Amino acid sequence: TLSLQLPWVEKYRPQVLSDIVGNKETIDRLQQIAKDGNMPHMIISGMPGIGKTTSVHCLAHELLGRSYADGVLELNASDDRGIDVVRNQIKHFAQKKLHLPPGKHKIVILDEADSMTAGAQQALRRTMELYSNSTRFAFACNQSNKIIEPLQSRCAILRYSKLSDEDVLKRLLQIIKLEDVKYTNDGLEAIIFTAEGDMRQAINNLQSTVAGHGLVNADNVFKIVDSPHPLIVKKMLLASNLEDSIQILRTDLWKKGYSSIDIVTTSFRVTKNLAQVKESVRLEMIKEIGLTHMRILEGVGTYLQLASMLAKIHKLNN
């Protein structure tokens, strides 16, 4: 009862570059680099649950073989990465002497490099250049704009795309085959629908199902999983009549336990990206939503305020 089982997200984390699904071109480039060598300074960008850290770790492992423990310096947001660290520890690591195969170099992995301050990034500049014949840098980030322009100039840009439904289904089917999990097509479709291109969320929900109810079907998935509330907000804001919008707001959001601040923020975000409505209408709707958001922030967060916001939105959209 006191022993824990390894989650499938860690038990089936890809260990070779061939097992990473999606972004076929970039993965092929990384595989060929590993086959040949001469890894350059690179920055891998993307969104959560796509395989950036997995890609960097697999590349480093396959490149350095037995010398992984001596030629890889990994630092993330859980470690101190200030100006002093960059100027002493990373500099010493880059100046270190180590024997590696002909076309191999030491690797400095900076996971979540976006959080790094400007001073540390500036200090890294000449260090990445003076010792490029023995050390190479691999940054992994979610927001590339947080990395300063001089650092971006020195590295190769690798922007990852969101995993398509086909790739997520392929990896999920492999996991099911390995774990011998009974499933139905609708259950897998629901898992993909909730995943939104996030493989980590897909695997977590797949484990929660089976762990919770057993056979994977839409019924059990939706019993444990909730359809993303942004879609509900979009449906509410696109209703033809005020009655339908209020009905959706009550039944699907208010009675489900969602807070008013969450609802208004989601409405703002959804209205921002409604390409099927004119820009002026969206701007007026955003003005009304901002008024309601300010009212909620002041402390008056009630069903009546959201209903009034919906009524004003329908007034504008007429």
Binding site: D36, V86, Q122, A123, S153, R154
Partner: protein, 646 residues
């Protein structure tokens, strides 16, 4: 055989899917694209034009050959076209043109000259490749000779392998490199003259240099090559070193007037190499001096004027406030982004040596992808060549889109882009979305609202709704600006409601611009609110000083003092000097003594009035003798003090 002019004559001329042609069929013909083409977008049309080697010019000029014209063309475009009598064609005309030149040549001197230039570029690339392979061969021979009685050349970054070796191999910024070389080659003469014999170039007065430009243009490379070519020994400090006043005054300072032991022990057998014994200081990445380097900038500025050896500073952006101390203590050298015609032969040489095909016609596009970054374009070539052996027009679009450099815009650029009517149209809004506008605001969220408020009254709109006037749109924009100001006050409060920043983006910048979006009717002006606010703060502090210097004798607040008391104080203090001459002094002094007023308070009070009661001209017109006597009388007596130890 076939002349371009004849084919153009055959094509119909306008008055005021596509077929595949042959390689370089449009070579030597300059094409300018204006308006909106129903079939191809601006980017797609430009790519199709560059496919055939045509040169695209952003502006219409007398040398222009043809100008494709569609719909929605600006008045300036039509005016230039009519003035310069330049032919224009339609989509069908361009389709016929792209297939009407099977001979890809045989035309006027323009095409022949373009072909000659292309051949010269190819020959230069071939010669560079030959020299590089010869250098590799001699290096291998030396290595073999050494081994008979360490870093592999295939294990180096392409940016290191093809780094410039001499100053003639650097692409672009020829003038800046020449200026730096001249400055460092005449440093001895300037030092002998105490840096006072300003030469024709004006570089003889500066003992320090400040190189500034965008990333990846060859600044550090140029500095190091210039220092090496002249024999100087290089001392370098980068951002990886803690360049604070404490350690700067204990480190590099001593080297400013000391010989180099390395130079003496390395050039002892050389002759005429005086510079070998001297130092050249290179401070790289001065703009990278963060809080970790306290007082370093001021110490560098002080050194710039008190250095006995040449000193070169390198920075990326020179126009920051933090770089003000170097205002007029160094010779400023600007390195601009190199043009796509400067690194062309270098790219052919790299392609030849690396055994991959790089069609020249797609080289230009790559330069725009990295915004003129040579390091970035070399890295892009190295990464793409890893799996793709051909860089042609069939895949350039994907590479360009996947390697786009996202540089945050500046206040003026943000204002220009956001006050443009194109993006707010249906098609423009479809391409440039509302999310993009909010991101453009967030690029600089502290100055975008002020710039928008400053520049929303100086545009000719193109988004006016039917029946609406410019004034009504301005009023609506002002109303939304006021609402955004209220939201801003709420954000910067005791509650720190930063979650409302996106809403502010829509209320302060996006919505008013969408209401008055159009074409700027004049120069974009910097926000005037900051200087006015500083002036208001200064005047309020002065008013408070006067109020607390006169509180004992007055019954009012600061506002009441300004609005009611000060005019009568003017009548009692300034008018007498204008009527009875010097005799007023005594009386005026008495009044000041009655309210614990000083000369500084007198000037401050005189500096408040506005409108018909401005005293600047009148005060200047006062006789000098009267003011001198007033000052003498004031300083010849003892006056009371309202507040002790102010």
């Amino acid at each position: 055989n076939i002349t371009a002019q004849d084919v153009l004559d055959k094509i119909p001329s306008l008055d005021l899917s596509f077929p595949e042609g042959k390689p370089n069929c449009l070579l030597g013909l300059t094409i300018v694209f204006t308006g909106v083409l129903p079939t191809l977008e601006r980017g797609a049309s430009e790519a199709l034009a560059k496919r055939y080697g045509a040169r695209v010019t952003k502006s219409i000029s007398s040398k222009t050959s043809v100008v494709v014209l569609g719909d929605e063309a600006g008045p300036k475009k039509l005016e230039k076209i009519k003035q310069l009598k330049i032919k224009a064609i339609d989509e069908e005309g361009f389709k016929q043109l792209i297939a009407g030149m099977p001979a890809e040549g045989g035309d006027g001197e323009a095409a022949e000259k373009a072909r000659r230039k292309l051949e010269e570029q190819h020959n230069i690339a071939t010669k560079e490749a030959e020299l590089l392979v010869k250098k590799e061969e001699e290096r291998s021979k030396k290595l073999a000779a050494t081994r008979v009685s360490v870093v592999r050349e295939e294990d180096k970054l392409w940016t290191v392998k093809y780094a410039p070796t001499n100053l003639q191999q650097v692409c672009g910024n020829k003038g800046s490199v020449m200026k730096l070389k001249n400055w460092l080659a005449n440093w001895e003469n300037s030092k002998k003259n105490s840096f006072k014999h300003a030469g024709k170039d004006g570089s003889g007065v500066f003992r320090a240099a400040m190189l500034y430009g965008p990333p990846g243009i060859g600044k550090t490379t140029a500095a190091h090559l210039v220092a090496q070519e002249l024999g100087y020994d290089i001392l370098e400090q980068n951002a990886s070193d803690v360049r604070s006043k404490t350690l700067l005054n204990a480190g590099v300072k001593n080297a400013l007037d000391n010989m180099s032991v390395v130079g003496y022990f390395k050039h002892n057998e050389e002759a005429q190499n005086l510079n070998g014994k001297h130092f050249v200081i290179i401070m790289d990445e001065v703009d990278g001096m963060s809080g970790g380097d306290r007082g370093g900038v001021g110490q560098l500025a002080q050194f710039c004027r008190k250095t006995s050896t040449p000193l070169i500073l390198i920075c990326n952006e020179r126009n920051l406030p933090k770089m003000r101390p170097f205002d007029r203590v160094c010779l400023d050298i600007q390195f601009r982004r190199p043009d796509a015609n400067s690194i062309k032969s270098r790219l052919m040489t790299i392609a030849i040596r690396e055994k991959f095909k790089l069609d020249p016609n797609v080289i230009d596009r790559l330069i725009q992808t990295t915004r003129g970054d040579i390091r970035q374009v070399i890295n892009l070539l190295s990464t793409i060549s890893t799996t793709t052996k051909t860089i042609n027009h069939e895949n350039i679009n994907e590479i360009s889109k996947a390697w786009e450099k996202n540089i945050a815009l500046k206040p003026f650029d943000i204002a220009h882009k956001m006050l443009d009517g194109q993006i707010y149209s249906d098609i423009g809004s479809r391409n440039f979305t509302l999310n993009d506008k909010i991101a453009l605001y967030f690029d600089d969220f502290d100055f975008t609202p002020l710039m928008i408020q400053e520049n929303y009254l100086s545009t000719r709109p193109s988004v006016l709704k039917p029946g609406q006037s410019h004034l009504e749109a301005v009023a609506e924009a002002a109303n939304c600006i006021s609402l955004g100001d209220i939201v801003e006050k709420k954000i910067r409060s005791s509650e720190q409601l930063w979650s409302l920043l996106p809403l502010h983006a829509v209320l302060s910048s996006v919505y008013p611009a969408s209401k008055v979006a159009g074409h700027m009717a004049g120069r974009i002006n910097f926000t005037a609110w900051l200087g006015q606010n500083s002036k208001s703060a200064k005047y309020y502090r002065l008013l408070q000083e006067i109020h607390y210097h006169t509180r004992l004798g007055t019954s009012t607040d600061k506002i009441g003092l300004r609005l009611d008391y000060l005019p009568t104080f003017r009548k009692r203090l300034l008018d007498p000097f204008l009527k009875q001459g010097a005799d007023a002094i005594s009386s005026v002094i008495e009044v000041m003594d009655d309210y614990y007023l000083t000369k500084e308070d007198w000037d401050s009070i005189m500096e408040f009035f506005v409108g018909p009661d401005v005293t600047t001209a009148i005060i200047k017109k006062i006789p000098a003798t009267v003011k001198s006597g007033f000052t003498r009388k004031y300083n010849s007596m003892t006056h009371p003090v309202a507040i002790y130890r102010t």
